């Protein structure tokens, strides 16, 4: 299939997205080939097919390997599975790839994660935008999906990227188009409220099961427990089918922020990230005093299998205060 390179004595989960941009799965330990690419075979592939002209990107925070197998031509981007790089790390990756690629037209980059799907697609699609093959994140993402997955142009773009992964490729597009490729200026914010619409059928259907964790730089910076008023104050409106919660004591936030919603309900499934729903945003790219995410823009409700629970008007809005000095 599309994911499989079966040629010249190799049998690998490896795709030429373009002639010079490869997406692949994790180069795995030992010789076993049952649903994995053995690192000895992957390193042999590159040394044979692209001698002295490859660079490998390992996007997994969870696992490295002996990079000397690849003649020390490995660059790590620490991304958790089903999550995103920081914008700083994304731009650093883009510059590293740019420097490498500009020096020789036969240079290649090989980007991998665990399966070579969501995290890989975030960086491959961003690279394709940088390299000018596409002008829009949507087209770059769909191209990656068309090459690396069963997705076909004209299909609903599902099964490839989390919602935040899609958002972060969009952030890169905005950085290229509006900020000259430079990191946007810092914006310091505090979250002061969260509003969730279409709450009926979600856990207890009134916010009472929910909690919200804010994470910055891989650390919890705030936890709110709605029923109890732990760092918050909950209001439920049955007629408007919504909960509104004042968020208290938020520290100053800057950069890439991850927000996770947890539940005590045994009727609300967990998706990725060990929670019912979550998302990332960057404070610098916030417009005005809030960010509102529709169902398709939130990680886990983005999957259609969940749409009996998260109905079409399910949204999450964060309200912010300006937290500059």
Q: DSSP per residue over 219-285, as a string?
A: EEEEEEETTTTBTEEEEEETTTTEEEEEE-SPPPB-SEEEEEEEE--TTS--BTBTSSEEEEEEGGG
Residue given tokens 């002639």 in the structure block = 19
Residues in CB range of 139: below 8 A, 6 or more apart:
none
Query: Where exactly are the structural domains of the chain?
Result: 1-182, 183-325
d(C-alpha 135, C-alpha 301), whole Å: 28
CA separation for the pair 100, 53 (Å, rounded):
9
Query: Cβ contacts of residue 80 below 8 Å, gap of 6+?
Result: 61, 62
User: What is the structure's resolution, reported in angstroms to one decimal?
Assistant: 1.1
Give the SS3 label for residue 59.
Answer: strand
Q: Which CATH class is domain 1-182?
A: alpha beta
How do beta strands 108-112 and 21-24 pair? parallel
Q: How many CA atoms lie within 13 A of 240 on its CB side?
A: 10
- DSSP for 114-159 reads SSSSHHHHHHHHHHHHHTTS-SSHHHHHHHHHHHHSS--TTS---S
Residue 184: CB atoms within 10 Å: 15
The three-state secondary structure class of 311 is coil
Identify the CATH assignment for 183-325 out of 2.60.40.1110, 1.10.630.10, 1.10.1520.10, 3.90.1150.10. Answer: 2.60.40.1110
Technique used to solve these coordinates: X-ray
């Amino acid at each position: 299939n599309k994911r499989r390179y079966r040629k010249d004595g190799f049998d690998l989960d490896l795709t030429y997205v373009t002639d010079h941009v490869i997406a692949m799965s994790f180069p795995s330990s030992g010789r076993q080939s049952l649903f994995r690419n053995p690192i000895g075979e992957v390193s042999r592939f590159f040394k044979t097919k692209h001698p002295d002209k490859f660079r490998i990107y390992n996007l997994c925070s969870e696992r490295g390997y002996d990079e000397t197998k690849f003649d020390n031509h490995v660059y790590r981007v620490m991304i958790d599975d089903h999550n995103v790089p920081t914008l700083v790390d994304l731009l650093k990756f883009i510059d590293d790839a740019k420097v490498w690629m500009t020096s020789d037209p036969d240079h290649v980059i090989a980007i991998h994660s665990k399966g070579g799907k969501g995290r890989t697609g975030t960086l491959v699609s961003s690279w394709l935008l940088e390299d000018g093959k596409f002008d829009t994140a949507k087209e770059a993402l769909e191209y990656f999906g068309s090459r690396r997955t069963d997705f076909e142009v004209g299909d609903v773009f599902q099964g490839v990227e989390t919602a935040s992964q899609i958002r972060y490729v969009g952030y890169f597009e905005k950085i290229k188009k509006n900020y000259g490729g430079q990191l946007p200026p810092m914006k310091k914010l505090k979250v002061t409220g969260v509003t969730i619409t279409a709450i009926q059928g979600v856990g207890r259907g009134n916010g009472s099961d929910l909690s919200m964790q804010i994470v910055s730089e891989r650390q919890e910076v705030l936890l709110c427990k709605f029923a109890e008023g732990y760092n918050c104050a909950l209001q439920y409106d049955a007629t408007d089918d919504c909960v509104t919660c004042e968020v208290k004591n938020c520290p100053v936030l800057a950069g890439d922020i991850k927000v996770r919603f947890m539940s005590t309900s045994k009727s609300l499934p967990r998706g990725y990230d060990n929670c019912p729903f979550y998302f990332w945003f960057n404070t610098s790219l916030v417009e005005g005093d809030h960010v509102t995410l529709k169902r398709e823009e939130i990680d886990n409700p983005h999957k259609k299998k969940t749409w009996k629970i998260y109905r079409d008007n399910f949204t999450v809005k964060l309200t912010f205060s300006d937290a500059e000095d």
